[PDB]
Amino acid sequence: TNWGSLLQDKQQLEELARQAVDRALAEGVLLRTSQEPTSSEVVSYAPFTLFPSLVPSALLEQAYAVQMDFNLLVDAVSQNAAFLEQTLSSTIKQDDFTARLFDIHKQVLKEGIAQTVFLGLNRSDYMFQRSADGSPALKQIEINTISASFGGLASRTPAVHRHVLSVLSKTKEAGKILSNNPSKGLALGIAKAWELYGSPNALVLLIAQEKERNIFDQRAIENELLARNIHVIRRTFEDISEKGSLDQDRRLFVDGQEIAVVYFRDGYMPRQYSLQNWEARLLLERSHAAKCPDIATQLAGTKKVQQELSRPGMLEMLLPGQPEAVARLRATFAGLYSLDVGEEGDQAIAEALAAPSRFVLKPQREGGGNNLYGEEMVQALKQLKDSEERASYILMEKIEPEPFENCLLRPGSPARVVQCISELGIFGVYVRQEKTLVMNKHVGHLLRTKAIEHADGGVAAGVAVLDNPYPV
């Protein structure tokens, strides 16, 4: 178990790190370099821990047992239009980006949805909260419903931790690492959706920007598709505007080829959309191809929607008659507070101002680097208290897991032995034809770990690194 003990001897560290890095590159745990995000002529290893972080087996089991419930929940939200408008009514007057996303959802609702096949590829993230007894409890940090990444690379890292332990003759521990293959499962969902669309020669369209350091993780899904004779074409929103078009039955065509599924790897942040990219996203949502996620499902992944769902009776109204599901889901909720104009918002603000190390302030963003904490959160709250703008955020109880030592490897920086905390993610996959759920599953996990000084996180954002859960 204890890694700290293996991290005190320096010559041995340098050697195990050398071992890990070479095995990681051989297993395909790669990213393009930051200096040339459009080129695969040169690449490096994605950041990762030297050893797999210990994770309570019961919590890992618990995270897995609630994924099917969260896939149901996200899918009920995306279909209940009144819930989404009421939930986001205040956010959309203050947040341009949520307004545009919501406005596409509205135009689409208006014209009628062309698509008849629906699917979600997501990742639900949790932390381990020290509880009353002392028992760590599984608490949800967020749910990611657009461009849920790192499932390809995560299938490749276990071999890397087994290797590091083998070098030290810890064959027992090496043997306990869990094998994990999420990209197979994510791919199977797009496969199912393609099958159901029903056009033998239609392609899966992957939406990605040209500067994309994480191409290998996307290629992994493409490899699993390609093995089942489903072809993917990669294109940017700009490409869609120049070459995407709808036929008479609203079929999407790209370069004359028919698209069955639109898998988004881009478009979860405002910086990714110019005026024309917004038209291309509307164009894709208006089409008959299955969308991954469709625009409503992307709205279901907002932090505001997450906060609303914790209010008593909210789970019950979305998943009526499903009390055990309701319970599994609710056990994972930590404190979530609306900051809308009103008494509840005023109270949450006063609590955050009184004990700022215990809350996080979150805008309706995705992908890391956008939440506010401690000093910045305090300063922002003091300006937001009296502004309508407050409605663009939500406030949340900070989980503060017990820190454990590990060693982080990131290209270009020396191996770093430090106190770290992890975040456990479970990938979910579901597909529905009209209103019948045809596939609903969990497909694997992702443990992301970071050095203790980072309030925020995310691998693509440069903070957390890839890891594997060592069951204890």
Place this chain on the structure above:
Amino acid sequence: TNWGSLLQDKQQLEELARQAVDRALAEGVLLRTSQEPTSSEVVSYAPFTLFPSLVPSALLEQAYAVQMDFNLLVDAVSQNAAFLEQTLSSTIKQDDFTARLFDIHKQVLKEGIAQTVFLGLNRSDYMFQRSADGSPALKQIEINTISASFGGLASRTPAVHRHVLSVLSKTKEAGKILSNNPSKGLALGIAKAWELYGSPNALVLLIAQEKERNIFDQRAIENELLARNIHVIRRTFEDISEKGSLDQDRRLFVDGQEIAVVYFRDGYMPRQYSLQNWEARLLLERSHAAKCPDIATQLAGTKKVQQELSRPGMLEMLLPGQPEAVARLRATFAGLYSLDVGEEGDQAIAEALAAPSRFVLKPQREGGGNNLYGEEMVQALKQLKDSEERASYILMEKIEPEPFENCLLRPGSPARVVQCISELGIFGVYVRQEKTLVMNKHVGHLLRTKAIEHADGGVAAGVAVLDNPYPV
């Protein structure tokens, strides 16, 4: 079959190349960059063809059916001391490098061989000669008995060619690519040798320079060892001099750890040895650890020894009573000429001077970039004719295979559609305890291809790229 047809459309080429490269990096077909040969912080794909080159199945079968014979042959040569001294008697007065190798072999013979376990990991290379009928015939180019590389990377590229064909929906052709796993087999030989040495905690010592772009191909063998709980330590000759020592029973110790097998990845060229590296190689050959190859076996891989073995009755005297083996081996020999002082040497020189595009002039070197052809060969022959120095070389019939179009991918250069020729290699593995052959096998193949303008070759030397034999 015909690749030329898929190489005429430019937008599609750029796209299949992009596909191949990304799949190649994901499968671990890597080299460190040339600018930082000591760092794995950044890497690229090893050069490779876009499609697998067509290879006559009968010749590929033939190359495989003679490997066990060549392993026997190389092993008989390394044990027959009179043959080696007589063969190399003239070379050693003119070639310092062969003199030093030979001198270590002599000192070791003198002190008596400490080692009791012997093994060879090699690669026998052939080209396809247009023959009388028109039928291509398998002809040996050389046999590589020291640092026989690219067996790890070759286990990884088939998935890459299957991918490229799959993208084009040629599932039939993709299905014909042969799976290949030489590093498993090479590793099994060092494993056998370690087993036989018999010390549970002794390590396999890999001799490699610090600047080594091909580390991943070496790590592949280390991975297979590590999976069988055999540990490898990587060290340079300089490290051996500073920290290697022999005990009383001539046991090799490195940093206090006992070495069972010495696997050479360096030391096949004079530039790799300073005066102290020469002492370290002698020190390792004097030891009780199994050597891969041992110094005599390295001498058995010289081009001069190859030339001598083609003389009538020479195979017969090395492998007495083995006529079918003799025949399989002899069928692969092309014309080989001694250039020693004397009538035969004068005649070969006159033939080479009369038709220089048909011969190659070879020094006793290894690894590519050292032979002489056409203009340089002619100029060298005119100076060597009357010199004692002529004995440092041998002359050989050039094989001129039919060229076929393929596309070569090399990092930093645009995909290049060109006429190419291939070289088929078969990896051999054998182990012997005292005088009993305990393992003798072929373990996989390596197809190396190059653009037609290159007289010479080799992947590490920058000319040939990795490929796969498409059986026709």
